Amino acid sequence: SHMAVQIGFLLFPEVQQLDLTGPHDVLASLPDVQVHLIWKEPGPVVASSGLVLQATTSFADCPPLDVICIPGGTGVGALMEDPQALAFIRQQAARARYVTSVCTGSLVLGAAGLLQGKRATTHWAYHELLAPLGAIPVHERVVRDGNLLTGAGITAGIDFALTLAAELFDAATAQRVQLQLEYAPAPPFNAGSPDTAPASVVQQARQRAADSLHKRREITLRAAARLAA
Amino acid sequence: MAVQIGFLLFPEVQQLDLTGPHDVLASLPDVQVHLIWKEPGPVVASSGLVLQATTSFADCPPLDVICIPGGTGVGALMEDPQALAFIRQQAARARYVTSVCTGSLVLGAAGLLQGKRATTHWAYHELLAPLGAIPVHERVVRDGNLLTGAGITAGIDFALTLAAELFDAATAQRVQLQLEYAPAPPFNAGSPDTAPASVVQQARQRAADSLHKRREITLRAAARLAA
């Protein structure tokens, strides 16, 4: 309807698609919501896995949003230095009811200046990059600070979206959606956190990310310098 | 030599049934993932999210794994002879025949659950028995080379289970850590056993019309298998 809650996800090249599609299916289950997928122009955008998604609106045509949500992925590094994307995020955040992200999407919020003095989380492997952007880093799965909600790595988007559902509506509605999604997880292994995974697995995860971390650290410090000037 | 994994992408799919497993499995080495429909091109999910099929039935390579997601659109598939014949064609040699949520009802309509242990979404579980399955109330059920997952989000648990079977435990653990899949749901309402009674009543009330329509489709599909 024309009174629908307006929810917008930034959809960018090399996004981690589950960061977006998990929350999307949770939030699209709520009453009278309209969901936008936003990029520089409508059309196909290819996720890091090769899955093709479709942006529904441009920055210029996007209506004022009640919720803005930034997913993460390999493509965040480019977004952290994209003045057009950062300007759009800041404009929408001025009036959004909730300003949100999943995984390394919080680094984009940081580059936009929206984490200064705020508690936030991100993917476990990139958590150290929050502090240079002014955030108070919190090692929890879903972190709230006022109208800022941030989720941790990839699959945390589902827990994040159920938390957001309860704030937009109420606990009963969020529970109904949880039941419809049969979200009673039973992972076959206990390796979802660096604290519980086998040490051998964590060490490989850290080394496989080392080059990306060093590159993102330099981008992060450039973005921080632009906030300081 | 790459492992060929195919998902059936159909109109009115529940997209998370597909996109959850897709991001898990596409993270593995030496795999190629296909999104299959009658023709390549856009296919709109039940939420309005637009996905893109990458291959037609005819161009799909022989699959190591076939996976049927669920959603509103399964009712049509259960009486679509082309889709059912394609599924049987690929199941004949696939190493694994699989589904998530109400995708197992499509496997049932194709005749592939006869005498097998299987699960589905909690609200439609009663429809497995008329399709010949032995219904099991577990989140991921394996019977030989058949793996079925329960409702929607069970696809993530299903996909990690499958990853370990295709490769090994260490490979599945690496992917689990990259996905930071250590869930901490904000409520305990993911199962009819644990949700408040008021929430269960509302969820059942909302599913009632779909369940009735699917009771009727299921009995026609079963009668075809019998005749």
Residue numbers in the entry:
A (entry chain B): -1 to 227
B (entry chain A): 1 to 227
Sentences from the paper on this structure:
Here, we address each of these questions in a study of diffuse scattering from crystalline isocyanide hydratase (ICH). We selected the ICH system because it diffracts x-rays to atomic resolution at ambient temperature, has clearly visible diffuse features in ambient temperature x-ray diffraction datasets, and displays large concerted motion of an α-helix that is modulated by the chemical state of the active site nucleophile. Upon formation of the catalytic thioimidate intermediate, this helix becomes more mobile and permits water to enter the active site and complete the reaction.
Engineered mutations at residue 150 (e.g., G150A, G150T) also favor shifted conformations of the helix to varying degrees. The refined WT and G150A ICH models are also highly similar (∼0.05–0.07 Å Cα RMSD). In addition, the six WT and G150A datasets show ∼2σ difference (mFo − DFc) electron density features around the mobile helix that indicate a minor population (<10% occupancy) of the shifted helix conformation. The near-identical WT and G150A ICH dimeric protein structures (Cα RMSD ∼ 0.06 Å) provide an opportunity to evaluate the cross correlation coefficient (CCCross) of their diffuse scattering maps. The CCCross for WT-1, for example, can be calculated as the average CC of CC(WT-1, G150A-1), CC(WT-1, G150A-2), and CC(WT-1, G150A-3). We find that the CCCross is ≥0.83 for every WT and G150A dataset, and each data pair within the set of replicate WT and G150A datasets also has CC ≥ 0.8, as shown in orange-colored cells in Table S5. The high cross correlation between WT and G150A diffuse datasets provides additional evidence that protein-derived diffuse scattering is the dominant feature in the processed diffuse anisotropic maps and is consistent with the minor differences in the crystal structures refined against the Bragg data. Despite the Refmac5 and PHENIX models having comparable model statistics and agreement with the Bragg data, the PHENIX models have different distributions of ADP anisotropy. In general, the CCLLM values are higher and σ values are lower for the Refmac5 anisotropic ADP models compared to those refined in PHENIX. By using LLM models that incorporate different anisotropic ADP models for the same structural model, we found that diffuse scattering data can discriminate between more and less plausible representations of anisotropic atomic motion, even when these models have similar Rfree/Rwork and CCBragg values and thus cannot be distinguished easily based on Bragg data alone.
